[PDB]
Amino acid sequence: MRIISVNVNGIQAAAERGLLSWLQAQNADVICLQDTRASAFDLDDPSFQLDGYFLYACDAELPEQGGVALYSRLQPKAVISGLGFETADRYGRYLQADFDKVSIATLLLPSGQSGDESLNQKFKFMDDFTHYLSKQRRKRREYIYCGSLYVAHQKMDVKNWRECQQMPGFLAPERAWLDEVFGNLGYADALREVSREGDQFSWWPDSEQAEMLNLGWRFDYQVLTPGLRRFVRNAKLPRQPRFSQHAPLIVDYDWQLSI
Numbered sequence: 001m002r003i004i005s006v007n008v009n010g011i012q013a014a015a016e017r018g019l020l021s022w023l024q025a026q027n028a029d030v031i032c033l034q035d036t037r038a039s040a041f042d043l044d045d046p047s048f049q050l051d052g053y054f055l056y057a058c059d060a061e062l063p064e065q066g067g068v069a070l071y072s073r074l075q076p077k078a079v080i081s082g083l084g085f086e087t088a089d090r091y092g093r094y095l096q097a098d099f100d101k102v103s104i105a106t107l108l109l110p111s112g113q114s115g116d117e118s119l120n121q122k123f124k125f126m127d128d129f130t131h132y133l134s135k136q137r138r139k140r141r142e143y144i145y146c147g148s149l150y151v152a153h154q155k156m157d158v159k160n161w162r163e164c165q166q167m168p169g170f171l172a173p174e175r176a177w178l179d180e181v182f183g184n185l186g187y188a189d190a191l192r193e194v195s196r197e198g199d200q201f202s203w204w205p206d207s208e209q210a211e212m213l214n215l216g217w218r219f220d221y222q223v224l225t226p227g228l229r230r231f232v233r234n235a236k237l238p239r240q241p242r243f244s245q246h247a248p249l250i251v252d253y254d255w256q257l258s259i
Helices: 011-016 017-022 116-136 172-184 208-213 226-231
Strands: 004-007 031-035 053-059 067-071 078-081 094-098 102-108 142-148 220-224 231-235 249-253
Touching: 004 102, 004 142, 004 208, 004 220, 011 017, 053 094, 067 094, 067 102, 067 116, 116 172, 220 226, 220 249, 226 231
Parallel strands: 004 031, 031 102, 102 142
Antiparallel strands: 004 249, 031 067, 053 067, 078 094, 094 102, 142 220, 231 249
């Protein structure tokens, strides 16, 4: 099983950069896209279709404010959208497909990088999602959340961590939010289950120098229920090719996706 996750920063902009042609040739079983910025009507373009793949989507009320999508080779038993709180449902930030024994979800948080309103929204979403995850632990079924979280967990998840402590993405409350997710709540960080090396980033400012000096942040995760933590075989965040400000997260599992 191969799962690819990419924050496309607008699926049309990314398609123009060749996103879909690249996706087509990656032999993924499920693909999770975040931040499509596309209405349900927009995603009904036949150009956004991938051969061999079923496509499911969720939209924000104002399409440019969110939107997430999911391609799957197998047809899921069910597809559910929303988490049951405003900051997710009003924004098309959550979509989950159910398979045998495991569900795979695409998850988008607000970045909080444009003022205090945005950051407050971000914190709200974090608390609500923590409530949800806290309710979900007793569940027998496994989950993989392909999450574009806009938070970097540890020092090694950001280049030059010291100047990043006062910026959204590496603030103490955010870091503690992921401390709670991967610690007390028992969830696993897919990539960290197979790699403990640094310099593995998924997000860069759209600059000419950040590319040269790799001034990156690791904002993109595949967050796992514990029953899956020993099933991670590979995890990669290649810098190229790229179709947005984010790098694709490619994770390979020793699981045979079914039903």
